[PDB]
Design a protein around this ligand. Sequence first.
Ligand SMILES: Nc1ncnc2c1ncn2[C@@H]1O[C@H](COP(=O)(O)OP(=O)(O)NP(=O)(O)O)[C@@H](O)[C@H]1O
Ligand SMILES: Nc1ncnc2c1ncn2[C@@H]1O[C@H](COP(=O)(O)OP(=O)(O)NP(=O)(O)O)[C@@H](O)[C@H]1O
Ligand SMILES: [Co+2]
Ligand SMILES: [Co+2]
Ligand SMILES: [Co+2]
Ligand SMILES: [Co+2]
Ligand SMILES: [Mg+2]
Ligand SMILES: [Mg+2]
Lengths: 574, 599
Amino acid sequence: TLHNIITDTENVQGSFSKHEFQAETKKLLDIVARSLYSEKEVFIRELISNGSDALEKLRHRMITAGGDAPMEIHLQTDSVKGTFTIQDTGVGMNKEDLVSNLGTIARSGSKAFLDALQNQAEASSSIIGQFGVGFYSAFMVADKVEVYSQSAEAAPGYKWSSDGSGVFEVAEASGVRQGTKIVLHLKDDCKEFSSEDRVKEVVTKYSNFVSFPIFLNGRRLNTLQALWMMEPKDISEWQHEEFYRYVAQAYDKPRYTLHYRADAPLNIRSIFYVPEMKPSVALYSRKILIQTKATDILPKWLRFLRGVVDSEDIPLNLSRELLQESALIRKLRDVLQQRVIRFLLDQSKKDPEKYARFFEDYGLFMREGIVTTGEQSVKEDIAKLLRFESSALPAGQQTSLMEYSSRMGTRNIYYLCAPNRHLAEHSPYFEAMEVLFCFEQFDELTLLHLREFDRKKLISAELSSEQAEDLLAWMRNALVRVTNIKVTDTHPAMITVLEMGAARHFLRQPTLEINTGHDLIKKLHALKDSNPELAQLLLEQIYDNAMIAAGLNEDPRPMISRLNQLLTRALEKH
Amino acid sequence: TLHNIITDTENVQGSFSKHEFQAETKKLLDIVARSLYSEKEVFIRELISNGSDALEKLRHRMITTAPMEIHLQTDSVKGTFTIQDTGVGMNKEDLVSNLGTIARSGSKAFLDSSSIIGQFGVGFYSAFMVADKVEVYSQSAEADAPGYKWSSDGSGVFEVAEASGVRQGTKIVLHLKDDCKEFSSEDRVKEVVTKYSNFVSFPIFLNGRRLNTLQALWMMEPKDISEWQHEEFYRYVAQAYDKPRYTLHYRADAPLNIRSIFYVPEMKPSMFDSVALYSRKILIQTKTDILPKWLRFLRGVVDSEDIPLNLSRELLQESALIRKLRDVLQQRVIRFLLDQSKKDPEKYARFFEDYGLFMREGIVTTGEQSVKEDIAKLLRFESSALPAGQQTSLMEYSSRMKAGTRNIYYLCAPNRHLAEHSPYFEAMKQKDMEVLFCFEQFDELTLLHLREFDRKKLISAETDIVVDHYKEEKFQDSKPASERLSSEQAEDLLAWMRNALVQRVTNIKVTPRLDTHPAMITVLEMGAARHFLRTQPTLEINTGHDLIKKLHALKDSNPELAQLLLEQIYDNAMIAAGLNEDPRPMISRLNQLLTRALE
Ligand SMILES: Nc1ncnc2c1ncn2[C@@H]1O[C@H](COP(=O)(O)OP(=O)(O)NP(=O)(O)O)[C@@H](O)[C@H]1O
Ligand SMILES: Nc1ncnc2c1ncn2[C@@H]1O[C@H](COP(=O)(O)OP(=O)(O)NP(=O)(O)O)[C@@H](O)[C@H]1O
Ligand SMILES: [Co+2]
Ligand SMILES: [Co+2]
Ligand SMILES: [Co+2]
Ligand SMILES: [Co+2]
Ligand SMILES: [Mg+2]
Ligand SMILES: [Mg+2]
């Protein structure tokens, strides 16, 4: 019944030949040009990153061999010639740099630069180059590429030129300004990148926080500081509100701001915002956008946060729009979860009222978090954020699991999840002679998934007599909608329900209790004989009023006409 | 003031040198090994794809008998993963040139048919993501050619020697690295095969047991697919346990190549944020959605040849293509659902029961008026001009409109009885336009966002009642002036009510448009007000209604009782208008009123 053909049957004879791995350069160029990036526009990102790196090298170079010039990135679109041009005033390239760096796929001069640096250096974390392929993204959109380059050394200017097809040319040129100018002659299906507004869209999308001024057709673009890199000390609330509206594409204010920077266990520069209004985070690296919707760095229940996470250390996929499977990323996610939880807890103690209102707006996310995480200490960490009412506190007052333990030789935390307080207080099960009252949606699924908190089990609780019994018997046969009617102040009756789950389901089998001492019931009894219509109308009205007061009839519209008929025929004797 | 440094200033001197592009092979190997694929498991996919290609080359070449299979073997004690195919194999120049050169693909040389998966020439090196050492035994079919053993580190060199006992085809053995030993466990490997290669055209055996690989039904002739085949395939792709209530098998060649199957489940939803995207029987990843968000209730599969694959085979390459495909699929699904509603209106009624919230969401969230109206073609309602229970559409409503009419009138109420006896419908009956009856909670928000349909403005009965004030409102009473309050009585009553409800209504008027109801609350933009409260009203009285005449008599006779009754009438109109706040505080007052009316 098993069919396997794999056996140790092979034996090498003769001798082995040795061979070095090779690489077909033309196919690699084609792969970068058509198969690497999900969108053509990304060539702009790559070229701008290169310009940034160039300027960064010059800044590094001016620390000792000091001297000169402005540090800028300039873009120019020519819609008539169909050209895109980028020029940086950076370190430039001599002929060996052009031949070696531009001419060799996967050779990165910026990688070699970074590897030679003292790790403490600024340039160590600002250089956005590793792979040695970004430049070839230009052939994604261009039939021809020309590069004019003038190195900062004292060296002629050069023109490098190619059509992307396995060969390029190098000649000497005048007069190249120090730095590098790249002219892309766009393909017919890419002329959109000779349009100014299109280019500006792309620049703001990926490179809006590049550390150097970016000019387009003589006008400056990137006026935004990357606030997540700066000392939390130096950010106004105004900086944060403007930055939040930009990064969240919003128009309100952040109600909470967490500016989290850490160097251990990994490099983290981030800002998280909780919006003011009632209901993602972008991933960056070295100030360049990776994902506008970071996918695996936060847990799914923290998707209500807005803002930015940047890490120098995150291993990037070759396309720079994905991350690589890594234990580092799961560690980062766990770290950020702990950090956000600690932040939220401390908010809840620094301002309990603001936190109450935060939890009323966003608690569904923490209920979901508790329900979905597998680790019990994480469930309890999140569960510290929950609020409830309690049998031992007035209505409206919020309390926590910690305070419930605080008011306990007692071993267990008893709870009752119900649509509202009236049904909870009249629960048969609320026969406890403290009970958490959990009125919020999905509360009971949350508490069941949580199981225990701080080692204590969360446990669910789950005038007369003439015709008291003919009055009541008449009512039993006239509303056969309730299963019992029994006799028990200001109200003539109330609706009571045995198990809260049934009421929950109904809102998506009740007991009626009557007060034989108040006037409308004595007169329901008195008009069971005298006037049967009026007694039926009054009966249905008392039932409906008890349903409303119990909170299980929130749209009384079906009753209104009947009520009017009751009223009209009750006032007919006036 | 502009600041631009870019000027046409540069010119060549002298002569040019010519150069060929080069490649740093060592770093390229490192990149394939650590930076190309976002997930290690895909090496299995790549190797299986290679085997499939080999078998295809054999299948093609022997159609001018041998077994054609892929075998996978896991050895958890030696930490080894082994794959062997019975395909064409490789001679020594194939091993040296094709395996030895990154981005060199022999499958390019093969072509010239649509079954070959490989195009990039790098998939093989995916093995070095998970393996310290790789060995390849290969025997080419073809012919008078010895067997070979190829072996390597991943580190810049590999070895080739002649070998005996090599079965025709290719066997690759991966010595897994220590933190990749998961791919030495059978259940993990089967997970990966099922995930990526469940539709491979050849049998795959794992440790001597054949894996249940599937036919790719979306590529096949729709008429040749039974309902049971669709039920089984639906259960697989949706990972479900019910059956599809609807099946749409959609193939197209223009404007794009499309092979797809969509299912609507029989069960009711629970899923508010779904279709798999494929190419050549190998899975791509939906991360980005190819359907609009309102169609996320669909299950199934989309395959399109026009979608370009990224080097890692987990992203797609032009998002304008994706928006075009999304619009095509949206159009096609709408057409399908409309045709379902006309071939079986009752089954469609239960579908619209169960899933209408998705179409409402689509209408509310889309920016384009033609798309809102396209989706709105799916909405169903009842009508004042149809028997209770019978459903109609916006298109049928406009088919019954008399030529001199400009607007589509609707009324939102909990059910048909409440709509039919609505005070607002009583006022609309005095006109003679059909009124749509909408029963679902978010119908009115939907219609407000839809605004117009087929060039006709959508107007609520409440709004129209308010507007008629500001026109010739030539409507007079159900009851002759004999059984009404006169003008003296009416305006004395009204003055009293203005003084008894001073900060609760903006004006109080008599209206001629009511019959059964004593009063109603009117607000110009009533739907928007209802919506707002779910986070200046006018009270209109029916001086022909008994409760109003007796309020008139009781302001004099019994002032306290008259105030209690007045506040009750106001509350009743607020409730009937869907503008009432929690009705619980009223109950005590109501009880008191009742007790004082029953003496
Ligand atoms: N504008 C520029 N000015 C100076 N040197 C440049 C410029 N653009 C590219 N270079 C050089 O050319 C090399 C190749 O660039 P590129 O192909 O983009 O790879 P990379 O920037 O090194 N790493 P990556 O961008 O992540 O692939 C760089 O490392 C630089 O040495
Ligand atoms: N099992 C095999 N049998 C025969 N030839 C094979 C086999 N595996 C690989 N080859 C050869 O080696 C080449 C390189 O394989 P590979 O690196 O996987 O790239 P590819 O399949 O051609 N394209 P891709 O899968 O998209 O990366 C193939 O084109 C074949 O010529
Ligand atoms: Co042996
Ligand atoms: Co160092
Ligand atoms: Co010139
Ligand atoms: Co007509
Ligand atoms: Mg670069
Ligand atoms: Mg391959």
